Symmetry: D2
Subunit: 285 residues, 4 copies
């Protein structure tokens, strides 16, 4: 398998006003990431792609478009998790067929699964597809149990618990860790994470790569200055509405990022558009 | 519309070992509710029916079977909510076509929706189907906003907040409230709820109806004795595994309740089956 | 033993502007509760009395004043719980010496105590004083949620009589009456009195009974008689009052309502905001006009 | 002013079996921290010192003993926060009179205080004592989570120097250094020292530095030098020790580790479990063998 370390943008999807996928806009988002953000890879079908508001067929169309547009230029991970395990297996087979480099899967949600149920879910996706898997996160003993399956590569770490982060890095040194919190990239990199998967790399890739590299070189003061500017931008993005603000910033860079998908507010208000313009002037110009 | 007050069993579904719907077993569960539990209605496609682990087509098949088997014998409510609003509209149209008496819809989950997004979700399902709606639950001001749509009938109240319960009953006296916590039926009925939707009525209907009726007549000590026995049974059901224990209790009554659907543990262990047998002997024989 | 069932006001305390106790005002609050609110007893030294912001000597002074003013006319429970167990024993001995009918103690807080430590705390207060105990449960402030098995362990001590259930979990409330039918439960959420009375609580201990004790007794007694429609009507009016009290500021509003009836309920103690704003006073006068006139 | 940056142990206190202070043992703990742990200073009267279970006079006694033993050899911060603001002012005046370099105070807890009330509490302690203040933030115990704007308001008082960040939110930690670059931050989670040092904290205040202060200084200094691999190795060994300490019982295990080095760290104070079990003692000896020998 392809090297999966480094910076991965969690891929946003362009939607039309009626909720359907805007394919031309989706390819422009992808091209922006590969060609201008210079990411190491794309993480497709995650929360950032508005995945859980879509049908199985719509998820497959996004997987097809992303792989067709990215070809073998960068690494591609397909998030195929769901509350429906049969759907996760169907999506995992499809992504595997398309040539995705590995699968990822959120823990089954809506109902409360026990750990045994969560491990059986991941083992089932792996057994039925033949593909390697990135888990989400549970404690050290439970990661150990997950890691008894040799096709589990590591975890997309999205909880800000740096004690567990250190414990995992020590206990399972040959397993990978990708940071999921872009605003805490520096402290995660100080503990040796192997990469980061994030929604803000769709527009702030340049700084994200600088933080990651400066931190691994021990240049912590310089990395912190760039994390500070990054977090001023992230703070404004969160206050204005995360998904809509990143799309509006992409629109100012000539990327047809389109609308959000309903039940999320689909169209940005004038105020939201105004705030996006100010953010672009201050942090991305 | 049909009277929707009273006792509604949240319908469990019978699955085969491979996860597919066992239609004969599903009809036996339905017949048990109508003919022996003597419920006022069935609440189909909710959490209890393992709905969120299923495909759109599987949800439609369950709606078809339940309406075919129940005909017009009792009231039928169809839960059609989802994170995918287009799926909720598709399911709401189908249930409306089949003749369901009203729709219900969980608040969109997985992502964090704002109140405006939640209200637009409910208004969209109503506008696209033409059917009345039962919401889930937010505070008094937000229920008021939901209740500006005249086709919203009331709420399936699943949070144990009896202060909000009283406030809602006072503020919106012509809207209905169904209790969602079977173990707190007495206190809910003391505040005048119009009915209850619950998973334990699939086997404990008799006592549920007695509690509801004794409480409305002011016979609180007698209602409490029956709530105590009910809660001894519920306590054992929860400890042993809710969905699997109710199915195992149904099996002891000659109802082919089958397996649970994966990612939930599909098969009951011997210990779980043993505990179910003890529960049946102590509380349902 | 002196009956501890029924309607108990959680005694409010009158403070001077500098934070010291206003004894004359405290006595007026006590008299208002006994003579006008017609309470069965007073719960003294609880959260409502602003207890946790005071010194040990101030807590002793409030115990002394309350017992000297109430004398033997009503039942009196003394809340003596603290994070300092030595203080709790000192206060429990003092309240016992004064003649309080029973002690009560909040679960030790701040630190995350184990169940054996909580049980040892209760057992120590009882052993050192010789007095009976009511467990004071208030999860919203403490963060401590004890289950049914744990109450069982506390109840192995025969001097633990029951619990002040300042919580809204009515599944746990029912489980308690099922498991330990001979043990007492006092409801702590005034806005949920009807549903708690439907489950057989033996009484209620509340801050709003300092001004709304007439309606509170009615809800309790009507619910016990099975007159739910009548009880719910009075619970509805009561909760319109409580909703306004909570939005305007609980402590300061109840004290301003008492002031309007001629009770010198004084200031609140710092670090709480000690004086109401003009807007808070105006809203309290409207609540009095609408609900207590 | 006396430099307050660097490595501070959160002073543990030695108690006798009956709960009274063991002055000789307390002095031995102080000496161990200064002479062996090589700390920059001591944080006295915090959660680790079992402060919240003590009387006001006991807290004063610990302040007196710690200052008499440490004298002027190291920096000394006095935590004087309480739910009773009058007590906090009394303790702050006493610690100021003794010569403590700075005061610190936990956010008022138990009751749900408003932000204006919290700010008034800090402003009152400062005004009545004339001493500088460190805000003590410990959300896991208090339930109080202040945001960036609120820290801004507290920092309008020039005598508020910074915050003891006993929390793991590193987004908020970064936002604090961005907004208020001239204000100090001390990390409070010993197991997360490396990532906090990566974000520029000015020091650390920790309970485990009573026994692991040599490694704690190394992690801090190596991270500041950008030697991440070396720092992470020492953080890894440190966290194996901390993981065992937490599983065996934090307070009793650190006291037993101190006892094995000849420091009479004594018992814990009730309502905490005062004595370790045989199994706890045996596990503490193994932790000493593996990590502190």
């Amino acid at each position: 398998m392809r090297d999966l370390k480094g910076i991965f943008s969690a891929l946003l999807v362009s939607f039309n006003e009626d909720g359907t996928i805007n394919e031309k806009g989706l390819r422009q988002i992808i091209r922006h990431n590969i060609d201008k953000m210079k990411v190491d890879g794309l993480y497709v079908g995650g929360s950032t792609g508005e995945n859980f508001m879509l049908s199985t067929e719509e998820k497959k169309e996004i997987f097809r478009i992303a792989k067709d547009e990215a070809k073998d230029q960068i690494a591609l991970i397909a998030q195929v998790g769901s509350v429906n395990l049969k759907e996760a297996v169907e999506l995992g087979k499809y992504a595997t067929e398309l040539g995705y480099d590995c699968l990822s899967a959120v823990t089954p949600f809506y109902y409360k699964f026990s750990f045994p149920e969560i491990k059986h879910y991941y083992d089932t996706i792996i057994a039925e597809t033949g593909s390697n898997m990135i888990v989400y996160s549970m404690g050290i003993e439970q990661f150990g149990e997950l890691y008894k399956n040799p096709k589990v590569l590591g975890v997309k770490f999205t909880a800000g618990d740096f004690y567990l982060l250190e414990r995992l890095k020590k206990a399972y040194p040959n397993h990978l860790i990708w940071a999921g919190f872009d605003e805490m990239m520096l402290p995660a990199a100080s503990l040796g994470v192997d990469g980061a998967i994030g929604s803000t790399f769709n527009v702030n890739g340049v700084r994200a790569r600088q933080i990651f590299e400066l931190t691994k070189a021990g240049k912590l003061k310089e990395a912190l200055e760039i994390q500070h500017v990054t977090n001023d931008l992230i703070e404004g993005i969160l206050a204005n509405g995360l998904y809509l603000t990143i799309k509006e910033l992409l629109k100012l860079e000539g990327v047809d990022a389109g609308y959000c998908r309903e039940p999320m507010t689909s169209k940005a208000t004038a105020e939201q558009v105004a705030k996006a313009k100010d953010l672009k002037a201050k942090f991305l110009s």
